[PDB]
Ligand binder design. Structure first.
Ligand SMILES: CC(=O)SCCNC(=O)CCNC(=O)[C@H](O)C(C)(C)COP(=O)(O)OP(=O)(O)OC[C@H]1O[C@@H](n2cnc3c(N)ncnc32)[C@H](O)[C@@H]1OP(=O)(O)O
Ligand SMILES: CC(=O)SCCNC(=O)CCNC(=O)[C@H](O)C(C)(C)COP(=O)(O)OP(=O)(O)OC[C@H]1O[C@@H](n2cnc3c(N)ncnc32)[C@H](O)[C@@H]1OP(=O)(O)O
Ligand SMILES: CC(=O)SCCNC(=O)CCNC(=O)[C@H](O)C(C)(C)COP(=O)(O)OP(=O)(O)OC[C@H]1O[C@@H](n2cnc3c(N)ncnc32)[C@H](O)[C@@H]1OP(=O)(O)O
Ligand SMILES: CC(=O)SCCNC(=O)CCNC(=O)[C@H](O)C(C)(C)COP(=O)(O)OP(=O)(O)OC[C@H]1O[C@@H](n2cnc3c(N)ncnc32)[C@H](O)[C@@H]1OP(=O)(O)O
Ligand SMILES: CC(=O)SCCNC(=O)CCNC(=O)[C@H](O)C(C)(C)COP(=O)(O)OP(=O)(O)OC[C@H]1O[C@@H](n2cnc3c(N)ncnc32)[C@H](O)[C@@H]1OP(=O)(O)O
Ligand SMILES: CC(=O)SCCNC(=O)CCNC(=O)[C@H](O)C(C)(C)COP(=O)(O)OP(=O)(O)OC[C@H]1O[C@@H](n2cnc3c(N)ncnc32)[C@H](O)[C@@H]1OP(=O)(O)O
Lengths: 277, 277, 277, 277, 277, 277
């Protein structure tokens, strides 16, 4: 998409950064330009005290139709290994920046999600789809295996049988099927999707943000640990959150529940407006 | 709950130990008193030749509403690190004793199941819920991450997307949702739950008890092994069961199927009354 | 089944090897004869340029009712450890040959699938069941734990709760339940099953066969890797596929999509008839 | 050793708890009495503000000659599985309490170290031996495999070849050989051993104690992680140490090096007497 | 080496099977003929009640100079993938049969040990070298990476730095260096090697053979487990050894130590001649 | 070191890129300027057809004295979390670029190597030290745990006991000790070090460069795999090297050994001047 700075756009609304792939006429294909610009935008939004949540959406009828077969594959193969490695590092680096983002991330998938879009899909903590969205590991249909981690995304989110069929047959899952097999959290009609995402973002914004970061990372990390190692790890993490959370939110919440009896944590969030312990 | 020995109760009925969290007016919150008494009760029931199955239920409207914010957190923080570590070891030790219990374990979850109740929920081999039960990682709602292993429980039982939403949003799953996402085996109306649990216990009691112990441990252990390592491990385990099972139940069953033709193992259990090989 | 060479049969139809367990009157039980003959048949079909897909079905009312309690267990125990180890190696070796087969594999499960049939069930990449099929870890019902890897199969395919219940209770899953819990891909009436399998095989045959092999192995392998290790591994695999695929199918497909615009990989396979890059 | 409270002794000298196995005439064999008393002593010393280091030594000519063949094995086998499991839990629990101890631990091994003494040997962070000490996995010589984790100790400390020979041949390593193969840190004549241990303890006491705890745990934990997972884990740990260390020792040390230039951390410890940042 | 049955020879002496690679004039290169014959010989010796130990040596100046560049590589590449896979399976299968052998195995390495000889070298439990032996990952010197697992052998036995240098530089280790870096147990002059191996074999033959098998497997297996998983695994293994060991050697040994006081297991093996418990 | 472009220097000599940390008067401390410039230099040298090997040395009396306590820690803490994360990503990213470098890497450590220098030390494939070099995890001496992966470096290279002592005691290893415990490959007098490194580089340059890359990565990767997974992985890697190596060096070498008999791979590298197969 001619200018690099035009390949991604964003708006800040009510402390949510709404970030969009912005190559609509190229179905939001991941070119090196988009991969560099997406990192730049993610890097500048990450530690803004007024950005609580990042939503990743797409302009036009695609969410993301994968890597750019022209600009990511053909043009880089022409500059040899050096060009291939530079292009790969640009794509992998922004998926990783999104995966470990300081703020909670949400995929808003209204349309086409193919191939190398699976990395960014997985890198979002939560994911909400339109019924009319279509998800495919289309890689087998153009003679390549599902790289950019896409095979691992399918295996880490979906049942083995479902991942195997998805990668071998290159057939598409509807939003409803993507939700049934846990590729995404939920599917709904396209005309309801933005409002649901906005509601989820507004709920996260009400939580202690430090607590949400430590929790979302804990979920990602304890997948790659034994039960017994994860038990000790979660204790170590809470000691870190104790340092990070200057608001001392656990003591604030304990006072509101035990002493004030103004909320029940089983039924709703503590009031982080209040600061008395 | 004033006296330590009153924090847990049990009944033995038809070789099933029905164990209940017994702090109903405190929603069965896990205080250090309950954590010590639960270990004591589990330890004394474990190797009783008349206890075939242990069911973990709760008195009052909660199953278990998590750790006691007053007695487990506030009062122990006041005695410093020493008090915190003593309290943590008491909670972790009984969840582990339950997780590796000599006898099959069943969670009977009729009501509230929150936070640090996830360890005991996972430590039960099987789990049956009331439709009216509510399951939550409420930790984020009082500003802490889901410790006492609860994050790992969510990740080891439920699809990653579901675990992520559950831990970040602190919203509750109904019994039906808890069953759909494999937090529990089944959900049913509260008025049907005890009878279903009683039926499941009576089925396990009819199996070779040594076989059930070796099998339930095998399921837990092979999650943390490669396929190829698990293949050899399962051979090693059967050699152990051969030693442990004095009834020589595999030869008893082989005679009943091959020679007597009185049962078909695909369709029902062998008669462990009979002892001829 | 008296002669070893009669324990397995196959037909080649439209480049699909239809292989059948052929001990119908013994419910296709895995005897040492069948284990040796199944390896021999799999070994001779594997690298045939006219075999694109292998389907594993069964003659008679069983798919596979497990190991032969008479010929695999009783008769080998009578020749001691030496006989037991020889028999075990014959069973494990053919399940492994099937699991890593050069060609895509499909389980066509019309009927009984018990115990040590789980290894071959898992060793097939894809699996399609009749509603009337019945799947059981019947091992607990004859006093043994689910060996021949069967416990690991249950844990690698199904949710932990479901695997635990399945192994401890020795109750059977219907085809529909086997599909809901991802033991198989799909369930349908028995009279529709062969046609669905034939359709799936004919779709795989249309893909680049080298691409399908590399992909199906990738799915199996990345389960046993961290996300970050799997990212690099998938790059290494594509470099291998580049060598293996003399048809240079990725460049063929790129031309058809970018230059010719005759297909869209999100919506269907490239035409591997064409050879221009 | 008739009274349980006599099976272990300790002295506090210059903030070092010198703990000794105290069954000299039974070569410090681990009986259930000693296993219970060792946990009690470790538990009461752990969080003493005047205990900086714990040294584990032995009275008489043995350090520890393993499990008590009479009181740990024979007498417990006589009370059946229940007695065996109680005895095993008592031994495993104190080795684990020592392995994760709040304070740095040192093994002072002057003499015999056999079998089930390997768990406590490994559970000590550091280990110093007399030339005249003798270390053996003597288990094979009395027909058992090296349990109580001893096989794993040998594999986690020594080269595979050395561990294999040690476990299969049941021959003894001298102190010098134990040091060459990294079973211990150092070996020296018995008459020099206590002074070296005293010197090592006095060096640890001069460090920031919170820093030593976080570091020693980090070493133990990162063995069971991939490089890339360990990188993130070590960041999480430092955030915890930031909370735990009220002395804010990293800022104290930075001032002494950058501003005051009174020490060089490459060459010695910062002065934790000073409190200015 | 013209006839397949001539590629391997063996002698039985004092219950030790002395097996030799027998292609001396081809430096004992692993051809498909040798790979098939080595499996056949290993398979027939394994469960002989008069074979306690297997030693793997070589005829002529090589132990094993790796895979046969002519018969294993060139001739099989000429029959395509099918020929390559058949040849690979023959080599891998016998290395694995040796690695998990029922009996203890010893490598007697008097001379050249190169490349694909590392699999068999590692598959032997113990290894003894001549000073004049030379060990090399010569693969880099003929433009291939160290396959047949050789890279993994180097990493599992030697320090990472040593393995890296060994694989990248294709320079040779002397016997003494091979012992210093734990590729083998010991190095000695060639004229002393056979007698040392004979002495080691005669020591293993005096141990309880079932105990040696369970122990040697435990060492190999606990490398691929967390400490805490290995603790439970070793308990499971002893339950298996209890079944396998009809001699009830642990009770025999306990009587000889506790009651008879005729041996000290720290200092020597129990007398397995005696059978009283 | 005032200008960013001055913090690193390099020379190309005989196809070796000699790269030096260039803040001699600050003992080559890793400031954000150096971390950015080191990535830039590594990135531009990596795919130069005239760069076969990269050596990492240091100007002045240090190799690398760790992170810059002023510019990496103090100044970034002053810009908050955003500044800390930016600085961490710059350091981690260049250590990783070096660790997976297309070309073989060598650490030339003539002097001080402290703390956060361990990441770059480990990221070099090979390492050669001066006797007068001093290696320390000095972190404990300034009250922090050994981050920037340094703890993991110590555990992945050195015996557990040695790593534990090194991290807890903050005492320094000499070059000779660093070599004995496998932190580096070799130690020699400082006046011999450059010539030895030059000789090692000139040997690597004579090998097939594609072969060296695939091999060095294989060594790093198979540490984090089971034996059985590593066996298959190494086959996959050779298929990749077959694609990457246009020189078809394995067939060139096979001709020189089998047909021409001009070299013996056990004793030296094939002549990659020659191109006939
Ligand atoms: C660390 C962890 O494990 S987090 C613990 C789980 N976190 C939670 O969110 C549960 C905390 N408590 C809850 O929200 C309860 O389950 C509820 C509020 C949903 C139950 O609702 P209700 O039926 O309305 O009960 P209510 O809130 O009135 O509780 C009744 C009593 O139980 C006590 N109680 C309930 N949960 C807890 C708890 N986790 N710790 C301590 N006391 C508790 C209440 O303080 C109250 O005590 P009081 O009447 O003596 O003042
Ligand atoms: C170790 C493992 O893999 S466990 C093996 C699986 N375990 C099982 O529970 C299956 C064992 N057998 C079964 O239960 C069968 O599938 C059944 C009974 C459900 C099939 O039901 P039916 O259609 O009624 O068949 P029926 O039991 O009459 O079997 C027919 C024949 O097959 C034989 N057969 C069935 N399964 C097996 C088996 N696993 N091993 C050996 N023979 C078997 C029967 O002995 C009988 O032989 P016969 O007629 O020559 O005497
Ligand atoms: C390596 C990977 O990640 S694989 C990439 C994913 N693979 C895929 O199968 C997606 C490839 N493209 C698709 O199939 C598209 O999503 C479609 C065809 C389903 C979208 O359908 P349509 O709405 O009919 O769009 P259409 O195919 O006409 O595409 C519109 C434009 O986007 C371009 N485009 C679409 N996807 C890509 C892509 N992945 N790379 C580059 N350009 C692309 C098309 O070339 C076309 O460009 P043009 O009009 O300038 O010639
Ligand atoms: C987080 C980590 O990586 S920990 C960093 C490693 N930690 C350490 O212990 C090293 C810290 N520094 C050292 O101890 C040095 O290597 C020494 C002191 C051993 C070198 O000894 P000397 O040769 O006597 O050098 P000296 O201490 O005088 O240092 C010379 C200059 O380098 C600076 N310097 C040395 N190391 C560092 C460092 N790690 N960060 C910042 N500046 C440093 C000194 O401040 C001094 O600056 P100045 O002269 O402008 O005031
Ligand atoms: C399961 C495990 O952990 S295996 C335990 C370790 N196994 C071993 O091989 C050690 C067993 N015992 C030994 O061999 C001793 O260390 C020795 C024999 C080397 C010590 O040698 P000596 O100094 O000659 O001591 P000796 O054998 O005379 O033992 C002295 C006393 O300690 C007792 N004792 C020694 N080790 C043990 C033990 N592991 N369990 C129980 N009692 C023991 C002896 O029975 C004897 O008791 P008695 O005098 O009341 O009859
Ligand atoms: C894939 C892998 O496993 S790599 C295999 C290991 N790679 C190697 O570097 C070893 C290859 N061969 C060697 O270098 C030999 O060990 C040597 C050269 C060191 C032995 O040195 P010498 O004693 O001088 O023996 P020489 O090279 O003359 O070999 C004698 C015979 O053995 C043959 N031979 C030796 N090694 C091999 C081998 N790996 N494959 C096939 N034939 C071999 C030689 O071709 C020669 O055959 P010929 O006399 O019939 O023509």
């Amino acid at each position: 998409v001619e200018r690099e700075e035009d390949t991604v756009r964003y708006e800040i609304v009510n402390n949510v950064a709404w970030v969009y792939y912005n190559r609509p006429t190229k179905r939001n294909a991941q070119s090196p330009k988009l991969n560099r610009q997406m990192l730049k935008v993610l890097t500048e939004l990450e530690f803004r005290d007024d950005v609580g949540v990042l939503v990743l959406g797409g302009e036009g009828p695609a969410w993301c139709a994968g890597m750019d077969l022209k600009e990511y594959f053909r043009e880089t193969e022409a500059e040899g290994l050096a060009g291939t490695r530079k292009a790969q590092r640009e794509a992998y680096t922004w998926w990783e920046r999104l995966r470990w983002y300081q703020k909670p991330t949400i995929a808003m998938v209204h349309g086409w999600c193919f191939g190398g879009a699976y990395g960014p899909l997985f890198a979002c903590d939560l994911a909400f789809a339109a019924d009319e969205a279509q998800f495919g590991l289309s890689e087998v249909n153009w003679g390549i295996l599902p790289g950019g981690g896409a095979t691992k995304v399918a295996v880490d989110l979906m049942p083995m049988r479902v991942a195997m069929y998805h990668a071998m047959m290159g057939e598409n899952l509807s939003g409803q099927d993507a939700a049934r097999y846990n590729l995404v959290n939920e599917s709904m009609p396209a005309d309801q999707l933005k409002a649901r995402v906005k509601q989820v973002a507004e709920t996260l914004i009400q939580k202690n943000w430090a607590t949400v970061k430590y929790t979302k990372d804990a979920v990602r990390r304890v997948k790659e640990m034994t039960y017994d190692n994860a038990e000790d790890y979660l204790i170590r993490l809470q000691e870190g959150l104790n340092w990070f959370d200057k608001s001392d939110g656990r003591h604030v919440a304990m006072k509101q529940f035990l002493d004030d009896k103004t909320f029940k944590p089983g039924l709703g969030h503590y009031d982080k407006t209040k600061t008395e312990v």
